[PDB]
Design a protein around this ligand. Sequence first.
Ligand SMILES: CCCOC(=O)[C@H](C)Sc1nnc(N)s1
Lengths: 237, 300
Amino acid sequence: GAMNSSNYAELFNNDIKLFVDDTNVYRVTVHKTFEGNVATKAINGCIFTLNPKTGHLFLKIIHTSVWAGQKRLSQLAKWKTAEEVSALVRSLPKEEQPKQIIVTRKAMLDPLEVHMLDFPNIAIRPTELRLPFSAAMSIDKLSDVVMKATEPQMVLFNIYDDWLDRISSYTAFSRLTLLLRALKTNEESAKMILLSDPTITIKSYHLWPSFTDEQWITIESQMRDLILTEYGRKYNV
Amino acid sequence: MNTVPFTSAPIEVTIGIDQYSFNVKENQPFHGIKDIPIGHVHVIHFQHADNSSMRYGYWFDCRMGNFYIQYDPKDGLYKMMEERDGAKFENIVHNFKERQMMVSYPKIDEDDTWYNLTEFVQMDKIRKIVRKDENQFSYVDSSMTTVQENELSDPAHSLNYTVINFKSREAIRPGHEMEDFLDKSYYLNTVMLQGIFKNSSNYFGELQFAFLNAMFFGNYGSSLQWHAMIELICSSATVPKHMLDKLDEILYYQIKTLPEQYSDILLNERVWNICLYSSFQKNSLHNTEKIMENKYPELL
Ligand SMILES: CCCOC(=O)[C@H](C)Sc1nnc(N)s1
C-alpha cells in the first residue's frame, strides 16, 4: 500500500520503481485584467518522473498549448499526467518497465490506475512521505529547458550527476531530498550555498556543482542549518 | 389467490412473506400461507429463534407450480418443494383452509408497496442470478457471496449478479480514460444497457432484486450490487429521462420500506451523498431526495 518511513529502504532495492510528482504540471501566473477582474496565464510545466535507485529523471515538459480550450485544468492536469506516465511506460522495453509507481499526491491514484489498466501487475502506490519534488523547478537547468520549450518534449537527466560512483542510492536520494527541501524552504539562500564559491563549477553534463566528498559534507551541513534556520524564522524559536 | 402450505412447524421460527412477518412457536399447528397475490414474484423467508444466524428464504411465483414448505430435520431448515400431483395439492390445501390452519397474506387494498418493490423483477431473471435449474424457485441466504466477491468460494452457491467495476477495461474505453471515468454514460448505455441487460427493465429488475436480498437476508454482496447499480446511473451525464424518473420511484419505495433501525448497515453514506448532492443526477431524484432527507438526515 502506502510508502512511509517504515519501508524506506524499499526505494533502493532492485525492483524497478518510479516516483511521479505532478505539482509542476499545471503552472499559472495570476493577474488583474483591464476591467479589474482576475485571470490566469499558464506557463510551461513538467512531470517529474524519477527512478530513485538510478537517478534517471524522465522530465516530460508540458507545453501551455495542451491547455488551450480546455476546462477544469487542475483536474485535467492529473489525467494528462497519468496519460503521459502510461505512454512512457509503454515506450519502455518490458524489462525496463516499473513494477511500482509511487505518486507523491493521492489525487493521482485514480487517474494513474485508470490509465494503467493494461498493466495490472504494476502497483500504483501513494506515499506518506512529504517529498520536496515541487522544488525541481529551482534547479536552474531543469527550469531552463521547461521555459524554453516551444512544443511538448521529453528530456532525460540523471538527477544524481555522477554521485553513484562514490555513494549509494540511499545516500544519493537523501542528498537530493535535502537539497530540494532547502531550495523549497528558502530558494535564494539555498542557491547562495550551492554557488557562492566560483571555483566549484557545474559540469556541462551535470545539474549540481562538482563538490568533493568533503565539500559535500560542508554543503549538506549548510543546508540543514538553513532548514533549521528557516524553521526558526517561521515559528519564532 | 394462491397458497403455500406447510407440512408442519417443528421449530420456532419467524416467517416472512414479502414485507410481512409473523412468529410461529415450536410445534405450533401452522400449515401455511393463503391468499398470495397472483402476478408478482414472492419471497418466503425464515429466521430461527434459537439461531438468528442465517436468514434464508425462497423466491417463487405461484404461476410456475404448486410449492410447499417442509422442515428437514437433517439439514435443519425449512425447505421449499414442488408438488407435481395437482389433485393431492388442491386436496391438502382445501383441508388446511377448512381447518383454518393458514395465515392470510395480509395485503391492504390501497397498498402497492410490493408491486412497487418488484415491478421489474421476473422469476426467469432470478433463476439466472441464482443457479439451481432443477427447481422453479430460488434459495437465497445471508451468507451467499456474489461472483464479484469471489473474484476479489463455492461457485454453485453464488449470486451471479452482473459484475460492475468502475476501474476495469470494460468500463473504460482506451483513449477515453478521463472522459469515461468521470462520466459513466458509455458504460451505462452501451456496455450495460445495450450490451448486457438489453433494456432498462432488466437493469431495474436486477437492481430491485439486489435490494430485496440485502433487506430481507442482510446479504452484504447484494447491498454492494444495489449501490453499484445506483451509482452507475447517477454517475452518467446522459441517461434516458424515463429511466431517471423510474429510478426515482424505485428508490423512493425502497427507502420507504427499509427498517428505520437497519439504515446504518444497509445504506452507504458515500454513494448516497454522491448520488443526491454531487452527481450528474443530483437534481433528478426529487422523491428519493425528499424521503432520504426526512427519514435519514443523519446519513447526509
Ligand atoms: C547523507 C544524507 C545527507 O542528507 C541528509 O542526511 C538529509 C539532511 S536527511 C537527514 N536525516 N537525518 C538527519 N539528521 S538530516
